Amino acid sequence: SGVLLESQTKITDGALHFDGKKLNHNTFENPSKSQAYDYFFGRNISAHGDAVKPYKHFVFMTWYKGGKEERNVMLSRFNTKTGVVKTIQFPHRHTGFRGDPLVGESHNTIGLAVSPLNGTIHMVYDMHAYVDDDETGRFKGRFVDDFFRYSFSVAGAADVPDDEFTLEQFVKDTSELSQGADDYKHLTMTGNLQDKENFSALTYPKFYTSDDGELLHYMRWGGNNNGAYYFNKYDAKNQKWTRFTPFNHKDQKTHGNAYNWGLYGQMKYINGKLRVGFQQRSANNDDRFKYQNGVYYAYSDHPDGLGNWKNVDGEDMTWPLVNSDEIKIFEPGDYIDHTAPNSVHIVTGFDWTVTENDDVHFITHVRSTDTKRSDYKEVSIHAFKPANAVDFTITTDFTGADSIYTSGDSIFIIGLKNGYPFVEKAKGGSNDFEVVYQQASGVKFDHGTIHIENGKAYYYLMEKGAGNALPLHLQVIDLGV
Numbered sequence: 388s389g390v391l392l393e394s395q396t397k398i399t400d401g402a403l404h405f406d407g408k409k410l411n412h413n414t415f416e417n418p419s420k421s422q423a424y425d426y427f428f429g430r431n432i433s434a435h436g437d438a439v440k441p442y443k444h445f446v447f448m449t450w451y452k453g454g455k456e457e458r459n460v461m462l463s464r465f466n467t468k469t470g471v472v473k474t475i476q477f478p479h480r481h482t483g484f485r486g487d488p489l490v491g492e493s494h495n496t497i498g499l500a501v502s503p504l505n506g507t508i509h510m511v512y513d514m515h516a517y518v519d520d521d522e523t524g525r526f527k528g529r530f531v532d533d534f535f536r537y538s539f540s541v542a543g544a545a546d547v548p549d550d551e552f553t554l555e556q557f558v559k560d561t562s563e564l565s566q567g568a569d570d571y572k573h574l575t576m577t578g579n580l581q582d583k584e585n586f587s588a589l590t591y592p593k594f595y596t597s598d599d600g601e602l603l604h605y606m607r608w609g610g611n612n613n614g615a616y617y618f619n620k621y622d623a624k625n626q627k628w629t630r631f632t633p634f635n636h637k638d639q640k641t642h643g644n645a646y647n648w649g650l651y652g653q654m655k656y657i658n659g660k661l662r663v664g665f666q667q668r669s670a671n672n673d674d675r676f677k678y679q680n681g682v683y684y685a686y687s688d689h690p691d692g693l694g695n696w697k698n699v700d701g702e703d704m705t706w707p708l709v710n711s712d713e714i715k716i717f718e719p720g721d722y723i724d725h726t727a728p729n730s731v732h733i734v735t736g737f738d739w740t741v742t743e744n745d746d747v748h749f750i751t752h753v754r755s756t757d758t759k760r761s762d763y764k765e766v767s768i769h770a771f772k773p774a775n776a777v778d779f780t781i782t783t784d785f786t787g788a789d790s791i792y793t794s795g796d797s798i799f800i801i802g803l804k805n806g807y808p809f810v811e812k813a814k815g816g817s818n819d820f821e822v823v824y825q826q827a828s829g830v831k832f833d834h835g836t837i838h839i840e841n842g843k844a845y846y847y848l849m850e851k852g853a854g855n856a857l858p859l860h861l862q863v864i865d866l867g868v
């Protein structure tokens with residue numbers, strides 16, 4: 388298969404991880420003050436999200452400093468030629484669920500990008516739909532002037548010698564809203580506070596690099612059954628970003644739709660175009676879908692995504708989008724025979740990709756909402772349209788996965804099995820997966836996050852262990868393509 392482990396490097400002994408108990412609506416205001424670190428959603432916050440990016444012979448990695456009492460934003464640069472790892476500790480510390488640092492908040496990843504055009508570094512972090520509000524608000528005024536958190540460096544910072552890779556490469560907030568001399572968090576990416584409302588209430592920072600070396604970024608507004616993707620672009624010449632522009636309208640019921648809907652999926656820049664693939668969550672609570680339904684896909688012929696959107700058949704899409712029917716590919720709910728209200732459960736197991744040969748691939752998963760019914764049904768689905776085919780092949784002869792990747796002529800499933808990375812590989816446009824790599828010895832891992840580039844998988848991993856300060860490792864896996 389050609390798949391092999393090319394390197395494994397320890398990046399730190401102590402990154403943040405939530406080792407306490409899971410809280411809920413009833414218990415989150417009384418978190419543990421002892422050594423263990425309670426959390427509200429999941430345990431993962433380091434080596435999680437868009438936190439690993441190669442750049443020339445470097446790999447940059449973000450993480451939160453471990454120890455429940457530490458939690459600083461960290462940036463590490465790994466020189467793959469010399470083996471040196473140099474780390475910058477930022478003043479901002481994870482602020483936790485709704486701003487209480489005693490409750491870990493796994494949405495609040497540290498997204499990362501490096502511009503190949505001027506060597507600037509960009510980080511957006513510790514965000515979950517925050518806004519300006521006051522003591523009576525959901526956030527109790529804890530994010531005033533600080534609801535969007537962006538740090539960035541001067542030009543060329545990515546390439547400085549190790550001795551010079553320091554917090555001094557990054558630009559302080561010196562605006563009228565600066566919180567002090569250690570404030571490295573900018574409220575907008577445009578450099579203009581007049582835009583701050585355009586940066587309000589966002590979650591999930593994710594960066595891409597265009598084929599021309601331009602950085603793209605998108606985030607999600609809202610969530611649940613009323614959400615939207617917003618994207619913007621980096622102007623390297625002026626060292627600032629554009630305002631966010633929507634893929635779809637929020638509040639769709641006020642823009643001409645029968646219902647509001649949310650989006651569960653990803654925008655991705657693939658094959659030289661901004662594209663999107665998702666399952667919707669309609670606000671309709673009377674149809675058969677308790678949560679998500681459908682598979683949806685579109686791509687833009689505009690270099691920055693500003694219009695000229697099309698569905699998989701090349702038909703023009705209303706933009707910003709209002710009615711998801713325009714770009715629907717198929718209905719995974721059709722693969723289970725329940726029809727009563729809320730009887731069909733679709734949440735986990737969705738992802739999509741497009742290969743360099745233009746094969747289109749979706750994976751998803753569907754089960755009965757009622758796990759106790761005697762006619763319980765559960766299926767994983769692989770839908771793919773080979774490069775030259777007219778229609779999608781849709782099959783349940785598939786074991787399911789949380790992600791799908793592509794490089795060269797192949798698609799990949801990459802994850803952990805019993806704590807060890809594995810790789811499954813298939814030809815693009817096919818369902819012929821085979822396990823081609825499986826680590827079998829060494830320290831085991833709790834979780835990780837993957838970036839594909841250069842025909843390699845950069846697998847940024849947290850080692851298994853007790854406590855809330857655990858080691859991080861970078862594995863570089865050659866995918867044999």
Ligand SMILES: [Ca+2]
Pocket residue numbers: 532533560564565566570571572573574
């Ligand atoms: Ca600030």
Ligand SMILES: [Ca+2]
Pocket residue numbers: 669670671672673674675676677678
């Ligand atoms: Ca529904």
